[PDB]
């Protein structure tokens, strides 16, 4: 019962660790150690695969360091391969990369830790910035799955991972209301966005930003300042520790699988035997049920991808660009090592979002006798009108229509309106004590939900398209609210009834 | 200066495509194409790579055509990695090259032909639009991203002017457990006449088995089969229900020559697509190693003048996944004889099939009518959706042609409105039958001439058994 197992490591003392781990797992059941090396040569990588896996019973490989041809030549025959030192989420793609093992999850798993960060103060107000990477896209689908089950989260902000001049997003962020924001990008894009939003003062008080892990580097603090808490999985990852954990759990696995039924032998090096691969998925599917309560780094639990569940994290304070542990997520519970969080404005507390809104964008349409639009005088002052009792009717300066012709170079005409609505909203501004923003539609549309002639879109137009796109806080119009209006919006109760 | 080393893996013949037209037709003859035909019988990958740059030891190719007579989508990703590392444009032909997984490889310069699963989705809804049948049930397993496909098809049925309502929950990953409890719990709520399909095939055999042990297979449902469930052509399982229908590419028109002739007629003249810039032709290399060692200077979209080409009127435009935007698709019924019997085709938003009469196998009845306002009023189908998309029945306005030949499908796409439309609706509601409703095109009610037949009365008394 002699079992051979491959390995790809960059250090010969780690090959000595591999041989010693072979001797340690030999305490049960016999093991066989084979050649361990490392190549920056993809041709020589796959060539060494099917010139050195010409042994019949090489059952597993532990590789080390980017993608690689051995993800393809060994991803067919089809043995489990333990990736150790690369963190691509492309290996999580179980379409092609189904037959691989990784100890640590790749960067996608930080979204659950950020949901735990939400649960730390049980807060809601958050905006995310997401780069245009399909790995980051898949992590975005993962966090959307994490949200579907509360959380306020305002919107996702899209980023291009090769662009600069993010100020077009930064002014939008100035218009935004949630003060808490986490970045999801690499550190080189973080150079641009940290220096730009610090230039554009989107630190708030120094509190606004938060950090993940992949943008943490040496230059990362030559950017975004102190107080802005980052994270890391496991500090000082001993590769020998992961070696010992993997060898212990695979010793458990080989004493499981070697007491089983008929097992096909793996082939012998890319020649003649391109017909036998089912044994790999066979003992891999049985091996995925194995678990690991032991471990020098602790107990190891497998997800669907075989990554270690119930991991730890170093929640980091930034005392003058330091990484001071204020807590650890102990598998299921965040266990705090609580120190003072600075947040350089001084947000040492649980501020729990924000308190912003007193400005109300009001996009309207003229309608007799509800709205009586009337242009102002030459100075923008309204032509003052009285009632039948001589009392001055209220006319707030109506702006917004940049078109009367539309088709000609019109201006945003300064008018002012009067009706039920104007005195009504002025009473409501006395009532709720907000401030007031007049807007109108230059084309003058309610705007119906027409089907767009492209692929499967039925989109509101006009005021409904604007409030759909968030271009209005308030729409005041004669509105017979249908089901399609009501299924998207909030609205207070109607008050007038007609036919 | 165009080297295309012809690669054959399997049992096919070399005289299927001689050069024999590449020298002759019209080739703007300053481009000098060169070929290298070879035929293999093994799929050994180290032999493949040593074949690659023992072939590319003869430097003057840099891009081949290749036919591997296997299933092998793993090698269809491996050659994407090969065009990603030893970067060159290639084109796939047959077998493992037709079976395309189409994952994201930004540095593979290699595209193929083929239909997308969204293109298959569009035709699989277009046939349901054509026969006015409504989707109520897809079955889905876990095999990757089916969920995005059903998101797209779900937005489509949201925005196809009719809410063709889905069943409740369709993912049943029963490969993890026994699953039979939730199999019966899901199959209890089924209210469809039709079942659309996931990707897997061994689970298709197993789910044929669980539909047999539930009682689903007989004639209350029919199945549309995309590729990767059909897989190989000449294999049918034993738990296979009667009357499946496959959709794939037209392999009876594609297991052939004169399509790699189209491929080389794209590769040459794509040489002059690049030479329309007068781009200097990149030097072919004795290679596998120095070509990714110099630089990756060649990685700037040479194929952008290649995915927008039209040869002999055929728009050969390659979609960005590695498929073609305009494939040729076939409709083939899997019969009770386990036989692959072609229903028809799809080409350019038209379902080029044999019969409007879809074949089947006492609910079915036989019915004829003649137009009479206001019993029967006018017939014009609204082309907003292409079918009569309001509240009235196709009366089967019969086709007519020149009398030198038959040319009788028997139907022009025209509905009918009136009293007897509602009468037929109420009587199909009360009695729950089906009908073969026609239109009298052979005269009026009719005057019986010499005792012989006349009209509507004639079309019934002609023993067509139609009910007037």
């Amino acid at each position, epitope marked *: 019962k002699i079992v051979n197992i491959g390995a790809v490591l960059s250090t010969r003392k780690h090959e000595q660790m591999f041989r010693e781990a072979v001797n340690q797992a030999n305490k049960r059941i016999q093991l066989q150690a084979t050649s361990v090396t490392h190549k920056p040569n993809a041709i020589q990588m796959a060539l060494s695969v099917c010139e050195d896996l010409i042994s019949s019973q090489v059952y597993a490989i532990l590789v080390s360091h980017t993608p690689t041809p051995v993800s393809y030549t060994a991803g067919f025959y089809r043995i489990p391969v333990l990736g150790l030192t690369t963190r691509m989420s492309i290996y999580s793609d179980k379409s092609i990369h189904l037959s691989f093992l990784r100890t640590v999850p790749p960067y996608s798993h930080q979204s659950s830790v950020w949901f735990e960060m939400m649960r730390v103060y049980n807060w809601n107000h958050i905006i995310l910035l997401v780069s245009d990477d399909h790995e980051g896209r898949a992590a975005q689908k993962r966090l959307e799955t994490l949200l579907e089950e509360g959380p306020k989260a305002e919107k996702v902000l899209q980023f291009d991972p*090769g*662009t*600069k*001049n993010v100020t077009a997003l930064l002014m939008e962020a100035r218009e935004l209301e949630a003060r808490v924001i986490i970045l999801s990008a690499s550190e080189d894009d973080a150079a641009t966005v940290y220096r730009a939003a610090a230039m554009l003062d989107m630190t708030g008080s120094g509190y606004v930003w938060l950090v993940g892990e992949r943008e943490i580097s040496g230059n990362a603090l030559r950017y975004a300042p102190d107080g802005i808490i980052g994270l890391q999985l496991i500090n000082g990852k001993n590769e020998s520790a992961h070696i010992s954990d993997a060898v212990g759990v695979v010793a458990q696995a080989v004493h499981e699988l070697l007491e089983k039924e008929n097992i096909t032998d793996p082939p012998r090096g890319c020649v003649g035997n391109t017909n036998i691969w089912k044994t790999g998925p066979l003992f891999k599917r049985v091996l995925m049920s194995s678990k690991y309560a032991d471990g020098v780094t602790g107990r190891v639990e497998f997800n669907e991808d075989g990554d270690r569940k119930f991991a730890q994290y170093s929640i980091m304070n930034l005392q003058n660009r330091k990484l001071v542990q204020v807590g650890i997520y102990n598998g299921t519970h965040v266990i705090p090592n609580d120190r003072k969080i600075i947040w350089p404005g001084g947000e040492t507390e649980k501020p729990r979002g924000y308190q912003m809104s007193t400005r109300l964008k009001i996009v309207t349409i003229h309608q007799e006798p509800f709205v009586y639009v009337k242009p102002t005088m030459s100075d923008g002052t309204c032509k003052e009108e009285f009632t039948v009792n001589g009392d001055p009717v209220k006319k707030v300066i109506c702006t917004g229509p940049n078109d009367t012709s539309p088709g000609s170079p019109r201006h945003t005409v300064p008018q002012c309106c009067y009706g039920f609505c104007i005195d009504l909203l002025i009473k409501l501004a006395r009532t709720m004590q907000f401030t007031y923003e007049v807007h109108l539609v230059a084309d003058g549309k309610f705007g119906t939900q027409e089907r767009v002639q492209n692929s499967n879109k039925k989109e509101w137009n006009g005021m409904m398209g604007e409030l759909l796109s968030g271009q209005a806080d308030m729409i005041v119009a004669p509105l017979t609210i249908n089901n399609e209006r009501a299924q998207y919006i909030e609205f207070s109760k109607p008050f007038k009834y007609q036919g | 200066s165009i080297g295309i080393a012809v690669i054959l893996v399997g049992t096919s013949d070399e005289v299927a495509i001689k050069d024999a037209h590449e020298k002759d037709d019209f080739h703007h003859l300053s481009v000098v194409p060169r070929v290298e035909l070879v035929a293999m019988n093994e799929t050994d990958p180290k032999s493949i790579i040593t074949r690659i740059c023992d072939l590319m030891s003869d430097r003057k190719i840099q891009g081949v055509v290749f036919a591997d007579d296997t299933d092998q989508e793993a090698i269809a990703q491996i050659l994407d990695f090969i065009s990603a590392q030893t970067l060159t444009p290639i084109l796939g032909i047959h077998g493992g090259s037709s079976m395309i997984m189409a994952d994201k490889d*930004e540095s593979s310069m290699f595209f193929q032909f083929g239909p997308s699963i969204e293109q298959q989705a569009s035709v699989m809804l277009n046939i349901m639009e054509e026969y006015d049948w409504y989707i109520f049930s897809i079955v889905t397993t876990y095999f990757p991203g089916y969920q995005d496909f059903v998101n797209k098809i779900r937005s489509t049925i949201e925005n196809s002017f009719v809410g063709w309502e889905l069943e409740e929950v369709l993912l049943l990953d029963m490969s993890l457990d026994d699953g039979d409890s939730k199999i019966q719990n899901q199959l209890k709520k089924l209210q469809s006449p039709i079942i659309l399909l996931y990707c897997t095939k061994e689970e298709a055999t197993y789910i044929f088995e669980v539909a047999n042990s539930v009682g689903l297979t007989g004639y209350g449902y029919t199945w549309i089969v995309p590729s990767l469930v059909a897989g190989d052509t000449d294999t049918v399982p034993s738990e296979f229900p009667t009357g499946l229908i496959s959709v794939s590419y037209d392999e009876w028109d594609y297991g052939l020559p004169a399509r790699v002739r189209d491929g080389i007629a794209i590769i040459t003249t794509a040489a002059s697509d690049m030479l*329309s*810039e*007068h*781009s*200097f*032709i*990149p030097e072919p290399k004795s290679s596998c190693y120095n070509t990714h060692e110099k*630089r990756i*200077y*060649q*990685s*700037n*979209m040479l194929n*952008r003048y290649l995915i927008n080409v039209t040869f002999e009127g055929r728009d050969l435009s390659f979609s960005e996944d590695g498929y073609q935007m305009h494939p040729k698709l076939v409709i083939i019924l899997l019969n009770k004889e386990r036989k692959w019997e072609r229903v028809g085709k799809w080409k350019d938003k038209s379902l080029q099939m044999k019969y409007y009469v879809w074949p089947r196998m006492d609910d079915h009845l036989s019915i004829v009518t003649l137009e009479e306002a206001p019993f029967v009023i006018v017939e014009s189908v609204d082309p907003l959706s292409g079918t009569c998309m309001r509240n009235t029945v196709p009366c089967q306005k019969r086709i007519i042609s020149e009398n030198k030949t038959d040319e009788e499908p028997g139907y022009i796409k025209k509905c009918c409105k009136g009293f007897c439309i509602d009468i037929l609706k109420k009587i199909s509601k009360s009695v729950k039958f089906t009908y073969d409703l026609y239109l009298v095109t052979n005269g009026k009610h009719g005057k019986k001439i010499n005792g012989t037949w006349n009209g509507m009365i004639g079309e019934v008394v002609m023993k067509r058994a139609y009910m007037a």
Partner: antibody
Amino acid sequence: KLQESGGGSVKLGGSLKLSCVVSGFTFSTYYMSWVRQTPEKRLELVAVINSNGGNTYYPDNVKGRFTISRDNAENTLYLQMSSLKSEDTALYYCARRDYDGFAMDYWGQGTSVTVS
Amino acid sequence: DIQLTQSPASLAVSLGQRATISCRASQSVSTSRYSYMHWYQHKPGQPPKLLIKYASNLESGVPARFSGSGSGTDFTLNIHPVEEEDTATYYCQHSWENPYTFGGGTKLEIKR
């Protein structure tokens, strides 16, 4: 690197041959161009040759008029001109391949050709 | 080749400012993989050195003040400090098929 020669004050449609002085690299592996720089400061590409003369291209006011000679043993580029116009008075600062390099790469100091 | 326009064709700016030179093509030029801009600056008597390689891909040997961007038809060059060595005429060539097509071009001087 690059230096032009053979250009000067010339006349109408007889002959003129430019000569690109070449030093400091491998000339036989790069792509060539022709580099009319007008006194109105609006550049025109006259012609292009490859590393072995197997790929030339002329625009409409170039074909029939001007031809390229290209030596790799000498490493010297040439532009044989014929049927010149007074609009063809321009400067020349040649440049080489930008490694698939639609644009050119490798400017040196050059010459001026004045057709008068 | 896709035709360009270039604006402003002459510009005098003061020192330290963020000088922006717009370029407007006629059509969309390239893909997400790369772009077409090859920017060139020099003076009369100077040869034009490459500044930008695709649209923001910077040629080596270029000081960090110069920074170009843009896509489709919109294209720009931003020089966020203006210094005394920046007086040069600026040109950008490209090829959808023809490697020399310009806009109107521009010459950058210094406002004093």
